[PDB]
Every structure is written in C-alpha cells, then in structure tokens.
Amino acid sequence: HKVDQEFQAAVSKTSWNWLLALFGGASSLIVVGLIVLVCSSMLINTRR
Amino acid sequence: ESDKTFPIMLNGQVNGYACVVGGRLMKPLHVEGKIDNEQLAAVKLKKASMYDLEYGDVPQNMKSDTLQYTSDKPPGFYNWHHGAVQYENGRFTVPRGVGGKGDSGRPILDNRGRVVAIVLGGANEGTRTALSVVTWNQKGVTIKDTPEGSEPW
C-alpha cells in the first residue's frame, strides 16, 4: 500500500450521515426535554 | 368539620388532619403518619411535590358526602376549628398563640360551610401568626400562600 490508512477520513459519507443522524436525534431530544422543563418552570413560577 | 375530618396518627399521636374535598382526599406531605380511617388507608396517594400534598380518589360510599371547595373569598373573618381566622391583603393570619404543630391539614371554613383553604404551616409574627396555606383562585388556580419564615406545622 502506497498510503497510510487514517480514521477521520476512512468512513463513508453515507455512513457518516447515518451515524450523525442517530447521534443527533438523542441530542435534539434532550435539548427539547430541557426546553420543556424550563418552560414548565416558568409557567409554574408565573402561575403560583 | 367533625364528620369529614380525619386525624393522621403516629405512634398513637395525631400530627395532622386529612380532609375530603370535592370527592377527593388530601393530606399534607411534610407530616408523616397513619390515617385513622381504614377505608382511606387503601387509597393510592398521588403526590404533588409543588403543593407538598398527596391527593386520592375516595370510594363510592364516601364520594357523595364530602366538603366543597370555594373560589370566592370576600375579605374579612373566616371560621376555623380554633375560632375565627382573619383574611386581608391576600394573607391568612390568626391571633398569636392560636394553632401550632399537628394542626396541619385542618380546613379553613366559610360562612356557608365550604372550604376556602387548607392550613399547612405558620409563622409566628409576634402580634399574629401568618399561616402558610394552599388556596384556590378566581381563575380556578391552586396557589400555595406562604409568608416569609413559614414553619410547616
């Protein structure tokens, strides 16, 4: 072989897209959960 | 009061009172004990941390015979087990030295014998005793009135 094998580039863009989607879905979900918690805290503070 | 207001025991000591209002039982969470009535001992008490109180649905026999809450609160004087309790400026007080620990959960009564609040604690303010109590509201809103230095009875 005439070139070394790296890692940051030796992963297909399609596979990268799938991996990013399945890793970002949970991140978006937890962000939404924190947003909902904050909104609930604001509502309960306002309506106490 | 006497018919529909049940003490909570602990080691044979009363440490609060439970009230059945609007077809549902309520008990305060800061107090720990055993409910007197056996029939209500089997009710699964859904807990509401913000209201420091658990509520449950009473059985069929007793759901007909309950106290009614009220929303409207004309300012002035209100009935209580320990006499008349005073309401002004969106705050409930009593003459000082009246009420204490173990009186938690005793309802506040009005002229027509309907509930307007439930006593949870007090702050002794020297002249009177500010009472931390949960109340209703015109918009059908439950609010936990708590003065500074509230001591949960």
> Searching chain A, which residue's CA lies closest to the CA of residue B145?
A48
Chain centroid to CA B96: 19
Which residues in chain B touch residue A47, judged by CB atoms under 8 angstroms apart?
Answer: 141
Which of helix, strand or coil describes residue A19? Answer: helix
User: H or E element: which one contains B141?
Assistant: none
- Interchain CB distance below 8 Å, B143 and A44: no
Cα distances from B106 to residues B26, B48, B137, in angstroms, run 11, 18, 19
Assess contact for B67 and B19: CB atoms under 8 A. yes
Assess contact for B120 and B91: CB atoms under 8 A. no
Angstrom distance (rounded) from CA B153 to CA B30: 8
* Elucidated via: cryo-EM
Which of B103, B104, B110, B132 does the annotation list as catalytic? B104
Resolution of the deposited coordinates, in angstroms? 4.1
Which residues in chain A touch residue B144, judged by CB atoms under 8 angstroms apart?
Answer: 48
Burial of B15 (0-12, 13-18, 19+ CB in 10 A): buried
Q: Which residues have C-beta within 8 Å of that of residue A29, sequence separation ≥ 6?
A: none
Chain centroid to CA B23: 15
Angstrom distance (rounded) from CA B153 to CA B151: 6
Angstrom distance (rounded) from CA B110 to CA B94: 15
Angstrom distance (rounded) from CA B3 to CA B51: 25
> Searching chain A, which residue's CA lies closest to the CA of residue B51?
A48
**Torsion from C-alpha of B98, B101, B106, B107, nearest 10 degrees:** 60
